[PDB]
Design a protein around this ligand. Structure first.
Ligand SMILES: [Mg+2]
Ligand SMILES: [Zn+2]
Lengths: 191, 197, 52, 158
RNA sequence: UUCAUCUAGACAGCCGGACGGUGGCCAUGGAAGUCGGAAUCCGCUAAGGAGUGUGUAACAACUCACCGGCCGAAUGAACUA
């Protein structure tokens, strides 16, 4: 159909500055700086009133106008990451063998170590992506918490931790052992 | 559809200008059963029209043409509000409406309003039922051939929803940590709305 | 044993899924079409069989 | 005191099921066959028809005195000889109920019946009659429901 | 293409309710809405099916049709090539 104009709004809170060169977005907020390259989407950014950015697609097809809302969501998540942050809480689930999760250093790289998963003698190592902070949560049993500006990096770290603990050669409906994302929210409460 | 809506609006008209003392009551969290009970109590005293905010609002705005007195009602038509029309004594009708406060039991995954505790008393349920206490880590022992909680234990706490097991044991031992009932917020009467009482 | 809440959490990822009848792909529980190209994105999906 | 309000569903004029009464009442010091006997004697009005007996557990006392249940009452008002499932089960229950009997049932239930008027109580009684697929004064329950809400056979609501 | 819903608030989304008569009747050792046959009813009703599923040995219990609270403009279904 080639819709003439499609537009999306990106609200910018007070403490956030968005610098948009051709398609390189730099969002700066209280929690830090996030950067994203969007030169693969062919959209147009325009600053309206220093609190609102419009992103537009001109003469766009269905896939193009869907990518427009995808871009709006990506930039909104960048702004959310620099204002509130992103935190994923994962639970260790096991029937018999307690999963031992720790933080170790290998040439200054901050791996997450998983031992005794389903009794395996193998040691699973998941590198911590830069910008992601790991905290083992008290007051809740067997909880790991991943916090950071980029929801992409936080969720990818959580996904790596979850996928490294997949059960092989067993009925996974019965062997539910693993490390599963239990909650996805923001670092700052109720913001 | 439009036919039924027009019928509803006509019923609204007659209810309004025959039963001036209507009660804007809050049906939020009120069960259908409790509604039926309170209605049966007020039978022959108070009719309870309980349509959707939007249609009631539009209808009363239209009726303003002949009965402008009801404009103040419109800003109050928000949330789950039901108009209990009547003319019988205000105090008595309101008391019957807002006196039944049924103890709502622990439905699964229901937000806990307080720090509900389970008490070191002889519950009396059959030995078999000890499984729930075991699952919830409730310290108990069979006394007089029945389950008896040895020590006080907080089962649920403020915040976290009441998980299926939590709710199951709570319902089993009859702790009902909720309370639902017809809650009047305002009362229009003799062409005047005012605080619920 | 696994406590009910953690068991339900694990089941959300292991058991509460759809399966394509043509290509057996593990699909989201609310999916209407398969995501795989081999099966032609068919709408022939079933719930993943529950243990016991 | 012991005011336990526990009850069951033993068939009319029938011994309360031994299997049912082994884990429920038997524990509460009440012989299952004794419960069956008292249930039968109470349910003589409900002969052959399942009806809750509202056995009031008042300090080791089986309280056979039945609570009339609308559907069971309709099956009784059928006035068909007590259902003899022993001779050919899948018994036929049509039992033309003169509407007077339905009104009597409604009078006996109004106390509890949510039915706002004596009309409404009779109305739901006849709905249960249609559920049991009987006939009332040689006319389909649904159609006499139409007539009773239309204004020919009215009900003297108290 | 055709038929539908919709500013007298469309669909989706989050939360509340989802009763009473009623374990409706029957086949079954037991089957209460939900392994099965028939009957496809109403009172309260904005609304509730003698029942959309999960679950029970049967219960009980969650679940959905149905109606609501919030947001506010287009949306849904079956088809054609
Ligand atoms: Mg094997
Ligand atoms: Zn497939």
């Amino acid at each position: 159909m080639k819709y003439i104009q499609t537009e999306q709004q990106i609200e910018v809170p007070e403490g956030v500055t968005v610098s948009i060169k051709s398609r390189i977005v730099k969002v700066v907020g209280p929690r830090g700086t996030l950067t994203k390259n969007l030169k693969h989407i062919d959209v147009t950014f325009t600053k309206v009133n220093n609190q609102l950015i419009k992103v537009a697609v001109h003469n766009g097809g269905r896939k193009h106008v869907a990518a427009l809302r995808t871009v709006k969501s990506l930039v909104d998540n960048m702004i959310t990451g620099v204002t509130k942050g992103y935190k994923y809480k994962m639970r260790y689930v096991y029937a018999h063998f307690p999963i031992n999760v720790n933080i170790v250093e290998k040439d200054g790289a901050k791996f997450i170590e998983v031992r005794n998963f389903l009794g395996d003698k193998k040691i699973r190592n998941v590198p911590v992506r830069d910008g992601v902070t790991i905290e083992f949560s008290t007051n809740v049993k067997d909880e790991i918490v991943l916090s950071g500006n980029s929801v992409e990096d936080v969720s990818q770290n959580a996904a790596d931790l979850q996928q490294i603990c997949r059960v092989r050669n067993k009925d996974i409906r019965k062997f539910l052992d693993g490390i599963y994302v239990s909650h996805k929210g923001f670092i700052t409460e109720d913001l | 559809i439009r036919e039924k809506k027009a019928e509803y609006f006509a019923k609204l008209r007659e209810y309004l200008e025959e039963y001036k003392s209507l009660f804007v009551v809050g049906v939020d969290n009120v069960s259908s059963q409790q509604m039926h009970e309170v209605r049966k109590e007020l039978r022959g005293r108070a009719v309870v029209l309980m349509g959707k905010n939007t249609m009631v609002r539009r209808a009363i705005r239209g009726f303003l043409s002949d009965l402008p007195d009801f404009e103040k009602l419109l800003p109050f038509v928000k949330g789950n509000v039901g108009f209990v029309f009547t003319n019988e004594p205000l105090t008595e009708i309101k008391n019957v409406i807002v006196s039944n406060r049924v103890a709502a039991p622990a439905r699964a995954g229901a937000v806990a309003p307080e720090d509900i505790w389970v008490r070191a008393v002889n519950t009396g349920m059959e030995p078999g039922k000890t499984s729930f206490f075991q699952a919830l880590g409730v310290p108990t022992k069979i006394a007089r051939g029945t389950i008896e909680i040895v020590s006080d234990v907080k089962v649920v706490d403020a915040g976290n929803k009441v998980g299926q097991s939590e709710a199951s044991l709570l319902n089993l031992l009859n702790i009902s940590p909720f309370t639902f009932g017809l809650t009047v917020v305002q009362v229009y009467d003799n062409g005047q709305v005012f605080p619920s009482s | 044993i696994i406590e009910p809440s953690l068991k339900a959490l694990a089941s959300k990822y292991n058991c509460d899924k759809s399966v394509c009848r043509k290509c057996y792909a593990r699909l989201p529980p609310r999916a209407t079409n398969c995501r795989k190209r081999k099966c032609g994105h068919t709408n022939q999906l079933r719930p993943k069989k529950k243990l016991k | 005191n012991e005011v336990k309000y526990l009850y069951l569903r033993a068939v009319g004029g029938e011994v309360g099921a031994s299997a049912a009464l082994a884990p429920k009442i038997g524990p509460l010091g009440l012989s299952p066959k004794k419960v069956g006997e008292d249930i039968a004697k109470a349910t003589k009005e409900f002969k052959g028809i399942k009806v809750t007996v509202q056995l009031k557990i008042q300090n080791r006392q089986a309280a056979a005195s039945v609570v009339p249940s609308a559907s069971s009452l309709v099956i009784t008002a059928l006035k068909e000889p007590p259902r003899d499932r022993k001779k050919d089960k899948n018994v036929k229950h049509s039992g033309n109920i003169q509407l007077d009997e339905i009104i009597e049932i409604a009078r006996q239930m109004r106390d509890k019946s949510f039915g706002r008027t004596l009309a409404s109580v009779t109305k739901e009684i006849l709905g249960t009659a249609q559920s049991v697929g009987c006939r009332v004064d040689f006319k389909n329950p649904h159609d006499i429901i139409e007539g009773i809400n239309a204004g020919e056979i009215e009900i003297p609501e108290n």
